[PDB]
Amino acid sequence: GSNEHVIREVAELYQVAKSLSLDPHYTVRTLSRTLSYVTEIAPIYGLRRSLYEGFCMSFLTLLDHTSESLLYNHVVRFTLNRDQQNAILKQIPKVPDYIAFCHYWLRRGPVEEQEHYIITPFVQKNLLNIARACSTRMPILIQGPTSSGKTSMIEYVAKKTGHKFVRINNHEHTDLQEYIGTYVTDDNGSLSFREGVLVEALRNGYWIVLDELNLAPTDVLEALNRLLDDNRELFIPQVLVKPHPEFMLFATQNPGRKHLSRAFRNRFLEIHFDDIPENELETILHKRCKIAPSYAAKIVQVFRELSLRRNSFATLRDLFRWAFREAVGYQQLAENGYMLLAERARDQKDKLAVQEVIEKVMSKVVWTRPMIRLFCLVWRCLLAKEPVLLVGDTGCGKTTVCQILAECLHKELHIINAHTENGDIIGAQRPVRNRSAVNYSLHSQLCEKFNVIDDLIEKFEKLNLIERQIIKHDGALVTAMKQFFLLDEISLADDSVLERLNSVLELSRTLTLAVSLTAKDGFAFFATMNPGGKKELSPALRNRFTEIWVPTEDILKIVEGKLHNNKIELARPLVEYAKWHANEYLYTDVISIRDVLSAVEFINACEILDLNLVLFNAVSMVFIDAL
Numbered sequence: 001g002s003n004e005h006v007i008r009e010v011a012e013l014y015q016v017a018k019s020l021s022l023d024p025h026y027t028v029r030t031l032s033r034t035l036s037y038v039t040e041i042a043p044i045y046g047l048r049r050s051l052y053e054g055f056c057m058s059f060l061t062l063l064d065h066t067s068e069s070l071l072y073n074h075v076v077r078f079t080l081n082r083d084q085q086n087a088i089l090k091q092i093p094k095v096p097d098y099i100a101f102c103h104y105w106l107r108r109g110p111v112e113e114q115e116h117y118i119i120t121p122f123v124q125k126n127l128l129n130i131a132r133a134c135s136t137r138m139p140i141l142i143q144g145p146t147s148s149g150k151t152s153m154i155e156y157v158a159k160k161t162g163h164k165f166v167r168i169n170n171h172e173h174t175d176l177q178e179y180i181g182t183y184v185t186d187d188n189g190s191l192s193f194r195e196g197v198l199v200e201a202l203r204n205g206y207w208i209v210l211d212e213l214n215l216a217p218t219d220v221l222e223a224l225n226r227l228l229d230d231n232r233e234l235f236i237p238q239v240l241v242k243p244h245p246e247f248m249l250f251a252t253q254n255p256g257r258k259h260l261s262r263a264f265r266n267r268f269l270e271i272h273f274d275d276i277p278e279n280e281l282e283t284i285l286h287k288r289c290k291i292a293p294s295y296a297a298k299i300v301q302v303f304r305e306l307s308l309r310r311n312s313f314a315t316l317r318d319l320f321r322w323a324f325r326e327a328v329g330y331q332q333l334a335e336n337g338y339m340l341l342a343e344r345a346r347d348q349k350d351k352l353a354v355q356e357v358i359e360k361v362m363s364k365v366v367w368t369r370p371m372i373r374l375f376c377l378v379w380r381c382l383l384a385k386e387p388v389l390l391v392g393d394t395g396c397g398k399t400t401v402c403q404i405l406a407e408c409l410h411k412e413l414h415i416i417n418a419h420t421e422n423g424d425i426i427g428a429q430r431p432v433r434n435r436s437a438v439n440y441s442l443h444s445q446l447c448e449k450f451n452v453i454d455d456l457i458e459k460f461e462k463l464n465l466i467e468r469q470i471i472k473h474d475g476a477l478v479t480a481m482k483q484f485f486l487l488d489e490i491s492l493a494d495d496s497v498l499e500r501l502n503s504v505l506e507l508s509r510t511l512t513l514a515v516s517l518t519a520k521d522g523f524a525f526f527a528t529m530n531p532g533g534k535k536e537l538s539p540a541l542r543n544r545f546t547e548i549w550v551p552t553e554d555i556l557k558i559v560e561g562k563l564h565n566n567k568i569e570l571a572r573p574l575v576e577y578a579k580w581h582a583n584e585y586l587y588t589d590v591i592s593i594r595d596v597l598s599a600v601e602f603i604n605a606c607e608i609l610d611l612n613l614v615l616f617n618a619v620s621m622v623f624i625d626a627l
């Protein structure tokens with residue numbers, strides 16, 4: 001509807017939908033939503049030629065070549081030259097109208113939010129302006145590579161105070177308690193469903209992102225699409241929200257691990273934030289890290305080469321870990337740094353040797369060689385204070401190295417054991433109070449107004465420890481950051497606890513109680529999770545921690561430490577006996593140290609004599625009769 005100029009523009013838009021034949025792949029009714037959005041931002045900061053410019057921007061958001069963008073700006077631009085295209089960049093009368101953004105960009109206005117150390121290169125500013133040009137209309141989805149920072153750009157734009165970037169990181173079996181939210185009771189009452197993360201962003205602002213929705217748990221996808229029936233109305237028993245504008249973004253991945261719905265991929269104004277360029281990253285790391293001309297440049301080139309040799313790990317978040325970790329001042333030392341950080345996740349020696357060549361193109365305990373290259377890595381990652389997982393064989397040395405470091409760095413390794421409430425009690429509790437405070441209320445009344453007695457509590461209630469008295473919340477990592485938290489078997493941990501741990505992870509701690517933000521004096525989450533309900537976390541939540549993978553006669557020496565006083569050479573038989581049992585039964589060259597451990601237990605529990613008969617009955621008890 002809303003000149004003969006616009007009739008020439010009708011000819012231009014028709015030329016665009018006619019040059020649809022320049023090859024799904026910019027399908028039919030995308031032009032309809034594009035015309036709707038052109039109508040949307042029409043008077044709101046727009047020339048009609050600029051309206052079609054921003055419109056066909058979202059006709060070529062997810063594309064291959066910008067010669068279509070060249071012809072599209074040629075059409076719209078012609079309807080509206082290099083000076084004219086610069087006049088399209090005049091945001092001045094556009095922004096004259098809602099907290100504005102930089103250029104072709106004046107969004108809405110909310111917590112007062114401001115900038116960051118999030119320095120932006122050319123292609124980054126391009127995609128940022130793209131997502132911004134999306135972010136004035138009102139759904140939106142943004143697929144691609146995870147290490148390239150989709151929510152990095154999303155929060156870089158949320159820095160301009162559209163809202164906060166509530167990154168709901170659904171891993172693999174995220175249920176409705178993550179989305180709709182339910183909560184603990186009260187001081188006395190019940191209060192079953194008393195919180196939210198999606199519905200909280202539905203009531204308030206704080207622009208949510210149901211991230212990683214590629215691996216959705218197969219029904220919250222369905223109820224979330226039920227929430228994409230109405231605009232911002234959420235029925236959960238209790239009817240609706242009807243929000244103001246924050247955003248409603250979402251992020252799948254580079255698309256066969258459970259491919260998303262094409263109906264869902266045709267119900268939102270989608271986007272494809274493709275990977276950042278190479279020298280783009282070379283510039284990007286030069287400020288957020290300390291910069292070296294060739295150490296930094298070659299690391300980016302090595303990331304490119306690791307891409308060039310090509311669900312394992314190649315995350316550039318770990319490249320930032322490699323950068324800020326490397327305190328080298330030496331190209332060989334930095335080579336070893338990027339090596340070992342890349343040699344963290346080595347699930348096989350083949351790819352380890354391959355990456356080694358690619359980089360080459362650029363105390364109560366017992367010492368041991370094959371665990372020294374776990375203890376040294378955990379020591380180094382402790383010095384960097386990075387988040388440090390540990391993955392591998394169930395019973396390989398994990399708690400040993402952890403207690404070894406807590407021996408060496410004198411510390412209080414508060415350990416835990418996962419698989420409800422105690423997972424929250426890693427962060428915080430709410431138990432019934434040990435009633436020493438019930439008698440401390442007598443001193444609290446002795447420090448109370450109008451004191452000369454529960455009748456005195458009534459008298460001070462006439463004119464908050466009284467409410468503490470009427471009510472009858474610490475935690476393990478709260479105690480840790482107060483005073484290393486080794487939450488072993490982290491794969492079977494919680495999700496909301498893992499959510500706050502993700503908030504606890506990246507270079508900052510937080511105590512999401514009415515809440516605060518905890519400090520960190522060395523509150524390491526020196527966790528573990530053995531390989532293999534062994535559902536891994538979000539690939540961010542894996543990638544947000546510097547992991548480590550792990551696996552001779554020293555097993556016999558270890559048993560010699562593990563055994564009784566004299567009682568010696570039976571294990572030297574028992575070691576090779578386990579070896580021949582291993583190659584014979586269930587053929588593999590693993591010492592299977594649960595078995596040898598229980599055998600050393602019974603052998604040091606031999607209340608009888610005749611050593612070889614003890615080992616006879618022992619290997620009968622553990623290995624032999626099991627077969």
Ligand SMILES: Nc1ncnc2c1ncn2[C@@H]1O[C@H](COP(=O)(O)OP(=O)(O)NP(=O)(O)O)[C@@H](O)[C@H]1O
Pocket residue numbers: 117118119120124145146147148149150151152153167169211212251284288316317320540
């Ligand atoms: N421009 C930038 N400036 C500084 N750091 C950046 C920048 N871009 C990315 N990063 C960092 O690189 C990582 C990007 O990953 P992240 O910000 O988690 O996005 P993401 O992995 O897609 N999270 P999500 O989208 O919810 O799955 C983070 O550690 C950022 O701090």
Ligand SMILES: Nc1ncnc2c1ncn2[C@@H]1O[C@H](COP(=O)(O)OP(=O)(O)NP(=O)(O)O)[C@@H](O)[C@H]1O
Pocket residue numbers: 365366367368371393394395396397398399400401530558593
């Ligand atoms: N060099 C060593 N010095 C002392 N003990 C060792 C050494 N190497 C291995 N061990 C022991 O071998 C076992 C290795 O298990 P470890 O992973 O450390 O704890 P774990 O509980 O068995 N792991 P997991 O069972 O998966 O939770 C422990 O009993 C260690 O004491």
